[model samples]
Target: VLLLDVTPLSLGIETMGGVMTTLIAKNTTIPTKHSQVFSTAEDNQSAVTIHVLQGERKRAADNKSLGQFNLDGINPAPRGMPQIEVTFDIDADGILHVSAKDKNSGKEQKITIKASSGLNEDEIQKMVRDAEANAEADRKFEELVQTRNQGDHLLHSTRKQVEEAGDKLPADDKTAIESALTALETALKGEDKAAIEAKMQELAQVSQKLMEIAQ
Candidate 1:
């Protein structure tokens, strides 16, 4: 039989900021209670939808949103300062539970999870399998978009830099910068955006920095 590594699972909800906003994070090593603070995403917005997701994704929507919970009747406050406290508990069996409360109002709610995510063992496996299946195609699509966006952004940024520099920079430096800009434009013709984006980032860094050095 193949033995898997035993570890305590920390659980938590993801927020709109593309952060795990962990009610519990992994590698606990022992039973523990973890807490975090967050504020309202919009001013005077009382209700905040708490999205629970797992694994790593740049956007909260990209990960598995295990479920949605919310806090309403928030005190009128500025964005990013509403002051909600999220608490977590892990039992000796390595199960996780979570709760969120308004510290100012002393209101609270909680839920217990026998597993890390809301997903059971079978469902989690299926999701993993699905992700693996799409991995290659997704990568290719991402590459295409990345190159296109970088090409567009590079064109605009270079023009801005030259316009900003005006007569302060030497004409040869401008020529080098324009050449890099042209190379970026050439790379954009290919469908893979990721490679183009990567190259453009490197080129932009050098070109922009060189202009700074010249000044």
Candidate 2:
């Protein structure tokens, strides 16, 4: 079998409660397709709007919207009776096309997903916005990296303190410091703030204990 790239985030439509119902999950092999059947919650004599989104947030509005389109001409029907099938088709080259089809009326609507080609005003705007969203330039990721450095500096003093004064430490104090230091080292490598903070909290309490070198 040939191996290809996969999508980075889950793609789906917004359900009730602004919850996302993933049709194509992230990391699925490329050149894939998915379909799901939906119906009007109440009743629809008018067109229905489908919101395509991508992200991890529990709420649909929180996720990044890829795009949206309306499936017009849906026949009137009782609530939850009409059959509407939504499909997501993705190509290996990063093109996504969404389709909404009526099982009864045989009507269809679609939206094509592509990237900016020729440079233009809107392209420049999107480009600038996307750069801020990038992992390398993202503010939160950069801040997390900066926070990890604190662990680095903290490690320097903690290591020397443990080495020069560890023997004088009580057995329980030694255990707490040693275990917490190890966990801090582990969490530092991961770059996850929550885990880093947890380990830091362990050593933070232990840090005050460094005043004793068994003197």
Candidate 3:
């Protein structure tokens, strides 16, 4: 009996920070309905482009774009002022129907999330492995961004103290700190955590020498 069928992959929209905001999650029974409210991200933004995506990845760019449509003619207002309600309706055959309506203007538009080709059976199964692999990579990428920001503060403070301590420091010590500064600055330009951590340690040690002598 085909009384119920489950969606093999998730259906969602591209969200802020490249996230995929899942509406109808994978394994949901067909003939299901879901709606979520999202608001403008910028002041006076009057249109929302909904890119329908299919996958289990945390990032929208990594998923397959199924279709897209814009719900315009919104009543312009500051960010988060207008309500954009997006809906996902799946029929028994698992065909999707999507619509977005602006609560302020009552304007609406919709599109069917049709695949360029029906899900490749092999590709459908691949998503599970892809999601697991993605979680690890995304976690590491976040660590990189946070660590790089720490680099910014370290360089700023170390440079300021080094300059003020100018002649109070011997020229020989200046050369040591100067070299570390150059090494750390080089590491800041790329994504290697090991190099960044090593260079940061080298700079911190020499920067301590400046700390003891400065005005």
Candidate 4:
């Protein structure tokens, strides 16, 4: 089996046109780096708002937003006329560090990210432990049901054998077998599975003796 690292968080960005950019997807190999270019939305946009979100959604509102920040004095030459460099870097420990720089102005904004929902490490461990316990209990219960069913089959077979040979049995043997059979039937009618088991065993032994007497 292949082994891999499980980091606690994911890293992504909301680009200029609300384009969601993922730096690292979930379970991606660690120590990963990704970068892209962005531009101002308006000619006189003095500040650029950088919303750093994390998750698989294409829209910022749909994703788990870690936080947002802005680059001050971000007046680019003009809207769609200048370029800014954006980068996302995730460490092996699952920590996210983001940085954005205006290529023309050398202005930069950096942030770190951590997601707040879903099971944490401790929670997942507890879930796995509970599942294992439940599985063991279920196995034991199934085994008990199987044993009971097997016993019912044996009782039915004994009853069939008694019916086939009762006519040839001696008087005393015939009476004992019939008495035990009636008690077994009563236990079954009462839904007393334990009593039924006991009575069935008694009937089987008496039946075997009757068959011997007939021979």
The TM-scores of all predictions, comma-separated, are 0.49, 0.52, 0.63, 0.48
Question: How would the candidate models be sorted by lDDT, starting from the highest?
Answer: 3, 2, 4, 1
Q: Tell me the lDDT of model 1 at 37.
A: 87
**Regions of candidate 3 where Cα sits further than 4 Å from its true position:** 1-3, 115-118, 139-215
Which is the winner by TM-score between candidate 2 and candidate 3? 3
Report the Cα RMSD per candidate.
Answer: 8.8, 17.5, 9.2, 27.5
**Clash count, predicted structure 1:** 4
Clashing pairs in 4: none
Q: What Cα-based lDDT does every candidate model obtain?
A: 0.62, 0.73, 0.80, 0.63
Best by lDDT: 3
TM-score of 1: 0.49
117-149 in candidate 1: lDDT tens per residue? 455566556656655776786565555554575
What lDDT would candidate 1 get against the real structure? 0.62
Q: Which candidate is the best by TM-score?
A: 3
Q: Which stretches of candidate 4 lie over 4 Å from their true place?
A: 6-10, 16-19, 114-215
Q: Per-residue alpha-carbon lDDT of model 3 for 1-215, expressed as tens digits?
A: 85657788888998655667899998987889999999886667979899898898876787878888999898768566789999999876657899999987989999975433336778888887788877888677656766775775677667778877878888888899889888888898887988988888998777676878754
Give lDDT tens digits, candidate 2, residues 102-150: 8899999998877331234554456445644553534565456556756
Colliding residue pairs in candidate 2: none
TM-score of 2: 0.52
